[PDB]
Amino acid sequence: PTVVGRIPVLDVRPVVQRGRRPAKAVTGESFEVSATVFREGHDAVGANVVLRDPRGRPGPWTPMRELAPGTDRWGATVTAGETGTWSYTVEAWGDPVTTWRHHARIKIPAGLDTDLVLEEGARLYERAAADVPGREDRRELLAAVDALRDESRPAASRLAAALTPQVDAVLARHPLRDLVTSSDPLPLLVERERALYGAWYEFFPRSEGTPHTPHGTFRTAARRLPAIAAMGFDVVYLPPIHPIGTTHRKGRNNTLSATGDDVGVPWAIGSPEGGHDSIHPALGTLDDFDHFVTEAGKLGLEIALDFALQCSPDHPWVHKHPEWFHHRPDGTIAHAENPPKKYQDIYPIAFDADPDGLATETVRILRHWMDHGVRIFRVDNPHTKPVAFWERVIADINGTDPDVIFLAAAFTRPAMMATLAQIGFQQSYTYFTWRNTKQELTEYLTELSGEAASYMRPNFFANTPDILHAYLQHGGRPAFEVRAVLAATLSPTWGIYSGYELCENTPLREGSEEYLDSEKYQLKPRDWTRAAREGTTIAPLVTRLNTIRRENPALRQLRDLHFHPTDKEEVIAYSKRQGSNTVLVVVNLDPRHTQEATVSLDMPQLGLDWHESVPVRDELTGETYHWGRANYVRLEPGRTPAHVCTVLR
Amino acid sequence: PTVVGRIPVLDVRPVVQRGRRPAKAVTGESFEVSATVFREGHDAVGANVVLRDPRGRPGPWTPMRELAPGTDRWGATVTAGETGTWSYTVEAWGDPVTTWRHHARIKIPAGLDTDLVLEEGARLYERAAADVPGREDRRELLAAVDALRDESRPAASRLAAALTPQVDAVLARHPLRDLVTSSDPLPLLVERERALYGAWYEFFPRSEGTPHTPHGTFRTAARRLPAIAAMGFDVVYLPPIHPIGTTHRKGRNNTLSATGDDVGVPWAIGSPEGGHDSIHPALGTLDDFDHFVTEAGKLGLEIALDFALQCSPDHPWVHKHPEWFHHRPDGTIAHAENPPKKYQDIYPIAFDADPDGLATETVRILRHWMDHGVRIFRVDNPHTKPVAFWERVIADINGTDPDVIFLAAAFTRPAMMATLAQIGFQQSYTYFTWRNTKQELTEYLTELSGEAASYMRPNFFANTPDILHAYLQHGGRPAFEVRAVLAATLSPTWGIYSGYELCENTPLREGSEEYLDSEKYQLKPRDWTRAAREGTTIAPLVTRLNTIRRENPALRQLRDLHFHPTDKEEVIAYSKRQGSNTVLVVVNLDPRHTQEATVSLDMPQLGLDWHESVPVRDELTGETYHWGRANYVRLEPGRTPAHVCTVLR
Ligand SMILES: OC[C@H]1O[C@H](O[C@H]2[C@H](O)[C@@H](O)[C@@H](O[C@H]3[C@H](O)[C@@H](O)[C@@H](O[C@H]4[C@H](O)[C@@H](O)[C@@H](O[C@H]5[C@H](O)[C@@H](O)[C@@H](O[C@H]6[C@H](O)[C@@H](O)[C@@H](O[C@H]7[C@H](O)[C@@H](O)[C@@H](O)O[C@@H]7CO)O[C@@H]6CO)O[C@@H]5CO)O[C@@H]4CO)O[C@@H]3CO)O[C@@H]2CO)[C@H](O)[C@@H](O)[C@@H]1O
Ligand SMILES: OC[C@H]1O[C@H](O[C@H]2[C@H](O)[C@@H](O)[C@@H](O[C@H]3[C@H](O)[C@@H](O)[C@@H](O[C@H]4[C@H](O)[C@@H](O)[C@@H](O[C@H]5[C@H](O)[C@@H](O)[C@@H](O[C@H]6[C@H](O)[C@@H](O)[C@@H](O[C@H]7[C@H](O)[C@@H](O)[C@@H](O)O[C@@H]7CO)O[C@@H]6CO)O[C@@H]5CO)O[C@@H]4CO)O[C@@H]3CO)O[C@@H]2CO)[C@H](O)[C@@H](O)[C@@H]1O
Ligand SMILES: OC[C@H]1O[C@H](O[C@H]2[C@H](O)[C@@H](O)[C@@H](O[C@H]3[C@H](O)[C@@H](O)[C@@H](O[C@H]4[C@H](O)[C@@H](O)[C@@H](O[C@H]5[C@H](O)[C@@H](O)[C@@H](O)O[C@@H]5CO)O[C@@H]4CO)O[C@@H]3CO)O[C@@H]2CO)[C@H](O)[C@@H](O)[C@@H]1O
Ligand SMILES: OC[C@H]1O[C@H](O[C@H]2[C@H](O)[C@@H](O)[C@@H](O[C@H]3[C@H](O)[C@@H](O)[C@@H](O[C@H]4[C@H](O)[C@@H](O)[C@@H](O[C@H]5[C@H](O)[C@@H](O)[C@@H](O)O[C@@H]5CO)O[C@@H]4CO)O[C@@H]3CO)O[C@@H]2CO)[C@H](O)[C@@H](O)[C@@H]1O
């Protein structure tokens, strides 16, 4: 057997780890399948993509086209349907009809061997007819055969009868394919829509209490859910909801010693009251948690829980499973580190004494929360547990419950980030918060929407409890507005951490990305009613962005994204498309100064002629403009962060 | 199982068609094996390459290093030995000693838990000692253990005794490796030296005749061999040596009708006198061919025959095996084309009626010439026969005779060129003749010496019977000198077609790359004795270039090549290295005007300090210079095409 087939079809993409891991999609998502296809000699080739579903049923006829002249790189768009494990193949073939037409278009006018050329055509069309299933299609081709062979008609008329649009249609649907050659199947894992598309809101339930009981419960925190749904969110991410240790508990502002009433850090999980399968007693009971999940569900909100595989020193595991920790010669366990950050309140887990016990217990815990309606987990610090451990855990959970979504909070180096996505994490956090200039955004999004999209689905959190970027610190409310527009329009999944709406931007100190008086170490009551009354919240802009996303299918996908040039360093422009829906976005990245620029649209990329002019509506204001190849924009921080425009038809 | 191991080792390179085809090397050749290696958490990792020979014997200890900070991309140089099918693996591991040192270097000065840290070290060094085979090495590590545990000495002195250079040496050779994880083996095909390295000379034996018998024979053409060996060539490439058809024979200058004594084109193979297994009767007999091969061998010359799988209309196959040709509806066979070039003297072969018969007969023909000492074949127009056909033929021949070298004359698009090399062609022709500016040469050679070197070995013919580039047409003798220096110093395999030495550069017409009065269509006697006597040949420069190659191992490899900046568009500089041999080349690409430039050497790339100064000898002149970071050069066309300098050691 030869590696290469009769008609070479090589290096089919997407591919992940050389075919050993699936490429990714979600239901309704379109992506490009490509390949290198060519043949020996000068005759034409064709190619097509056969996408097969979980029961092996092939999809529709999907012909490919050469993507750029001279490259022999071919492509076509496919669309994923129902969830499960799919496969895709590229078929390549000699295209004798195209070859014959090209010869005939030249030889018939020149008068060179014309009876012979037309007779060659007739025999091809005869072979074409025989392979066609439809009876009226077959009759069309046989009529062209007889016209080709009618030696009483002039040569140019006999030929023209084989080149009608009615004949082209039969052959475009059922072409004559010589020497059909297949690639080996590549795997595709199709997951639910929420894995790619959704808006996320993070808050601490304990902060939403009362004057008489400052520490919030699930019952009091449920009152926040209606406002979260009104801002157009789909997922509520809760920090750890378990008991919190007392030994080495941290105080306010990440000080080493907790005082009397200090609540500690939710990530320091475990006490005598319970571990990862228990509820913090100040939050309420498991029953109260069910009522919270039920109320969320009625508002169209899914709950995502933090899963943080680590322990306070008071966690039951410390004595029940000592072999799950690394001990030093004196018996002590070294607290976790991520230098120069120290985590004196927690122990990390060791994996090499009892890997089986840890995996068994991990999937038991996840299944417990799954039984109470949690179908999404934000996995804290996945990059400090072994990569193969997560691969096992995710395969075990998704083997019985393929709807469960895991989000990797992998704030680490690129290779680990990529690997975690490739071994099965449905979503990843990204370097988004550290991409603020036009060049940084353009480069990074070109990476995320290109090759990485076959294995990674990004979740653009504009802030997190650990990340208040200098851009927001120095820019104030106009910077919050810019980052919300960017996050919501550049990824189909974005999110914010509570307080973002209020433009909370006071850092711990200069050159830090921590918040002053961080919610991680203290209760943080906020006057939501007052901020709404006084207009000192950007909640309306957040709400409008989420409504724009819900109404424009182009913003519910990742891969179709193009950047259009402007003549100002501070102004960035881009478009996204999905069927007949086109969204065009222009953002002023300067939060202090007004910017005027000329935006020069690559018009072919919008499906339009260079000289054309199209109406657009800015969905932030309701204003209509008329934009063509070159358009003046004026963007004033505080009044207009950006234009977010739909192309009107 | 999990796809990912305990310590991730991912994306090992080189790789060809995802591991389904071997990467390439030759005996004595060095190349880099690389991989992505990292682990969870902050602790250090190490890696090493295990290269295994055809009997499975592992090579020496080959530790890898991280190639650039923050990339997690690791590499090391391996060297191929004996010919055959090898394999390579990357092993990755936790490096606990490096981890412990990094902690100890900080914690011991700071005074934090010092007894505990040193006791942790002692236990690691104890584990290290146990795995070491040498008895004096083991004693060194156990002495460091006792020093680490001596609680009567100060902490900094106990530590320092574990960090001596004597201890470092033991651990660099025999490190303590945790959680050793392997990649899956990748294949490596190691071929003989000639596949990568050699100088080739093409000539037509029929042109080397006498006054009484103008059509040369093998007996008369053997008298040309001594001068070919004196120019330092290793391979003689002969155009087809078979009978030549009479039907549609071409005349002089590619005219359609041959006159009385016109000899025709060697590539129009076959007559009633025989086919591809026969000798043209005007060349002599098989016995005369054996004498020619024997005389070549005595001069250190190997013969390479053209194998051109195509037929004149008089070839016996036309009537014996009609199914080996495509016939039109009237029974005629269309002559071969490569438009707008027409080949009215030949028929192409069709492969889909009798693929088995064609492969069987093809390997029979090749084996016949192999029995008469031909171990190298130049395959004409491989890109017009199926790719899988060559894959089958090459695997069959190399399965019994792995020393046979096939050279692909694939003047075609990049994808086909690459694929032919990947399916087993030992060597390829390249786009060299169409790379003449500094930018064109720098870009193309960076491609050939980088990733393509794992599957392709280039043969730089400065001219061929079908390619006289405009650069040579317009530049005259100074241009011939430049292209010879470039070809001989940039690839370990180069060649010329006879007449290049004489600076034959008259084209068929303006804008053509054909020669006027081409040797393809006529006998071309050359007065070699007269040109040598009159100094109108660049044979001496060719001879010197080949001697320089024979004396400098850096010029007998491909992969180690670096371009150094100059401040003139017409002056190009580069270096090549192999062990302690370094060659530096500076070429003036202007054949009409003298060029003076400053050559600014990247000194670290030569293994040297920025402020250093090193003696070099120009091997073209014998002159010695002293060159550092910045060097004036003056290059005058006709006197000095280039400097070809060795670094004196
Ligand atoms: O008796 C029979 C017959 O015998 C004789 O004929 C023999 C010859 O003696 C024998 O040597 C041989 O020669 C054939 C050869 O086998 C054929 O393939 C063909 O090759 C020609 C070719 O047809 C020409 O067009 C020309 O192509 C060059 C090109 O000029 C040059 O620029 C370059 O181009 C490549 C470029 O450098 C690359 O970068 C790349 O381009 C990329 C772009 O960069 C990218 O941006 C994007 O656009 O994609 C592009 C790729 O698509 O690729 C470019 C090419 O694709 O290289 C090409 C290819 O080398 O020159 C070649 C070489 O001459 O014809 C010759 C000559 O016939 O076989 C015949 C038959 O046996 C005798 O001569 C005859 O009279 C007798 O009848
Ligand atoms: O009760 C216990 C504990 O609870 C709390 O702590 C929690 C947190 O609440 C929880 O969220 C989480 O946070 C951890 C996180 O899991 C850790 O990974 C870590 O992450 C930090 C990180 O340590 C920082 O260094 C910083 O990293 C950024 C970096 O600043 C940023 O610039 C960027 O860097 C990447 C760069 O952008 C890329 O281009 C590329 O760079 C390339 C270069 O381009 C190339 O030229 C060459 O140089 O190679 C480079 C590659 O190396 O990659 C760069 C990546 O290195 O991205 C990095 C990574 O995101 O910030 C991150 C994020 O904060 O620490 C956080 C915070 O602790 O887990 C803990 C524990 O449960 C509570 O806070 C604590 O007090 C309590 O004790
Ligand atoms: O369509 C979105 C846009 O709609 C509305 O804009 C309208 C303007 O408000 C209105 O005035 C008009 O625009 C005129 C403009 O008034 C006029 O002054 C002129 O603009 C000049 C600048 O004055 C000049 O400084 C220079 O500015 C830039 C230049 O654009 C840039 O390419 C580069 O060279 O730097 C220069 C200096 O910074 O040139 C421009 C013209 O190119 O001409 C404008 C053309 O019409 O009409 C607008 C609607 O078409 C909204 O008010 C606005 O917020 C929305 O963004
Ligand atoms: O080492 C290899 C080299 O050895 C020999 O060169 C020596 C020369 O023979 C010798 O004369 C001397 O070179 C002097 C030169 O004589 C003197 O004129 C000066 O050169 C000036 C140019 O006159 C001036 O036009 C300008 O030229 C370039 C410049 O180099 C370039 O960087 C750019 O700016 O364009 C300019 C315009 O074309 O500047 C240069 C000086 O930078 O100084 C030279 C200093 O050396 O010493 C040479 C050293 O060995 C061989 O003769 C020669 O063939 C070999 O290549």
Author numbering:
A (entry chain A), B (entry chain B): 15 to 663
Passage from the reporting paper:
GlgE is an α-maltose 1-phosphate:(1→4)-α-d-glucan 4-α-d-maltosyltransferase (starch synthase (maltosyl-transferring), EC 2.4.99.16) and a member of the carbohydrate-active enzymes database (CAZy) GH13_3 family. It is the third and defining enzyme of the four-step GlgE pathway that is responsible for the biosynthesis of a branched α-glucan. The key contribution that GlgE makes is to preferentially extend A chains, limiting the opportunity for GlgB to introduce a second branch into B and C chains. The enzyme consists of five domains, four of which are typical of the α-amylase family.
Co-crystallization and soaks of a different catalytically compromised E423A variant of GlgE, which lacks the acid/base catalytic side chain, were carried out with various substrates and/or substrate analogues. By using mutagenesis to prevent GlgE from slowly hydrolyzing malto-oligosaccharides, it was possible to obtain a structure with malto-octaose bound to the active site. The occupancy of the donor subsites −2 and −1 together with subsites +1 to +6 indicated that this represents a product-bound structure that reveals the locations of the first six acceptor subsites. This showed that it was possible to obtain a product-bound structure in the absence of a donor substrate analogue. The non-reducing end of this malto-oligosaccharide occupied a pocket on the surface of the enzyme, precluding the ability to accommodate any more glucose residues at this location. By contrast, the reducing end glucose residue was flipped relative to the other residues such that its α-anomeric hydroxyl projected into solvent.
